[PDB]
Amino acid sequence: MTWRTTRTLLQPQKLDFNEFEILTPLVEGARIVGLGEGAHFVAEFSLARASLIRYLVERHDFNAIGLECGAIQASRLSEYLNSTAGAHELERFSDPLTFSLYGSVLIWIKSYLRESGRKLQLVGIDLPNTLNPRDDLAQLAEIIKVIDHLIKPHVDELTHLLASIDGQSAVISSAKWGEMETAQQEKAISGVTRLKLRLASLAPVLKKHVNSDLFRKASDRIESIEYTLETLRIMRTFFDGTSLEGDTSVRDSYMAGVVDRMVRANPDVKIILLAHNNNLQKTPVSFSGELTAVPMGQHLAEREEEDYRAIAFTHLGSTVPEMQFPSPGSPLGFSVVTTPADAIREDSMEQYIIDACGTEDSCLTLTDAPMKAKRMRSQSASVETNLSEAFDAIVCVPSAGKDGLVDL
C-alpha cells in the first residue's frame, strides 16, 4: 500500500498517471516539491524528472521550476524556453555546467511547453553555478546607476576587484579566488557588506514607484554576490586546507532563502525544485569531505506552512557517473567518469526497493512506514539518515547511465 511499480516512469510521452496516485496525498497542500537525483548527469534521472514534472503540472497545477543556477543564468534559460523565431538552440542560452546538469530536461521542457500550450516560470534558486560574480555585479551597477548613483563608484571598484573570478565552475573560480591577496579578498567582502547595509537602510525611499522593482532586484544581486564570495572562501578551504565542519551549509541556506522569499512574495506559485538528493534532504547530510551539513531541504522543512515535500531519486545500477577531482586539463576542473556505485546492503533503501517492487522496472515508495532502510546511494557513495524524516517519497530506476549530452 506504500509502494508502487511504475512501468511508464522513464517514458514521459506515454505516462500512466495511475502509477503516481501514491503521491497524491503528500502532494496535496504542497507548494514546494523537490525532485532529486542520486547522482548528477544521469539519463534515467532526467527521464524520471520529466515524467514527474508532467504529473505535478498536469494533475496538481505546479507552475514554476527552480534550478541550481543563478537568477541571471535562469533568465537566459527563460529566453530559451520562450524563443522560436530563429536558430535558438540551448547552447546559445546556457553555460557549460548548466548545459550538462539540466540540458536534457530543458530541451524536453521547451518541446513540452510548446506542444502542450502550457506555461511555467523558470527560477534560478542558486548562486551562479560558476561562482563568477560578474553578471550579478554588472546588473547591480546598471540598477544602482538609476536608483542610487552615489554608490556607483563603490560598485565599480568591486567589479574591478573581482574581475579575475571568471571560472566556468566552482573549482575554477575558487582557484582564481585563492590567487587574490587576502587583503583584496577582505576588502571585497567588506565592500559588499557596506553596500548591503546601505541599500537596506534606504529601502523606504528606493521603493518609490518610479523605481519599479529595481530596489528588490538590487537587494537580490547584493545577496547573491555576498554568498558567492563566502562560498568561494569556503570552497578554498574545502580542498586547500582547513575546511570547518558545517561550513558547506552556507550555499544551501542561500538557496532555501531564495525559495522561501519567492514563495511568500508570490502566493500563487507552486514550484518544482530540481536539485540533488543531498540538497533536497530534510535532515543533516554527511557526505564526502563534510562531516555534517544542513541541506536546503532542512531549512524549507521548517516553514510553518509545512508545504515542502522532497522526493529522492536513486537507482539499482552497478555503476554511476561520478565527478573526478582533480582533473588537470579538463575545461571545468573536473571530469565525469563511470565508476562502480556503492554496494547495496540490507539496511539500504535500494534493498527495500528490491524487496518491495523487485528489480524489473522502476519503483515509487513512501518513506513513512517502519523499515530496515537507513542508507541510500548518493554519487558513488551513500548517505545515512532517518529516511522517514529525510524524504517524503523515493523514486528508484533500474540503472544510472551517463547522460549522452554531457561533455566533461
Residue numbers in the entry: 11 to 418
Text taken from the publication that reported this structure:
One of these resistance mechanisms entails the enzymatic cleavage of the macrolides’ macrolactone ring by erythromycin esterases (Eres). EreC is an extremely close homologue of EreA, displaying more than 90% sequence identity. Crystal form I, determined to a resolution of 2.0 Å, has one molecule per asymmetric unit, and crystal form II was resolved to 2.4 Å and has two molecules of EreC per asymmetric unit. Both crystal forms show that the protein can be divided into two parts, a major and a minor lobe.
However, there is a notable difference in a loop between residues 295 and 303. In crystal form I, this loop is folded over the rest of the enzyme, and we have designated this the closed configuration (EreCClosed). Not unexpectantly, electron density corresponding to erythromycin could not be explicitly identified in either of the two structures. To examine the binding of erythromycin to EreC, flexible docking (Dock v6.9) was used to build a model of the EreCClosed-erythromycin complex. However, it was found that the closed conformation of the loop was actually compatible with macrolide binding, and it suggests that the closing of the loop can be important for catalysis.
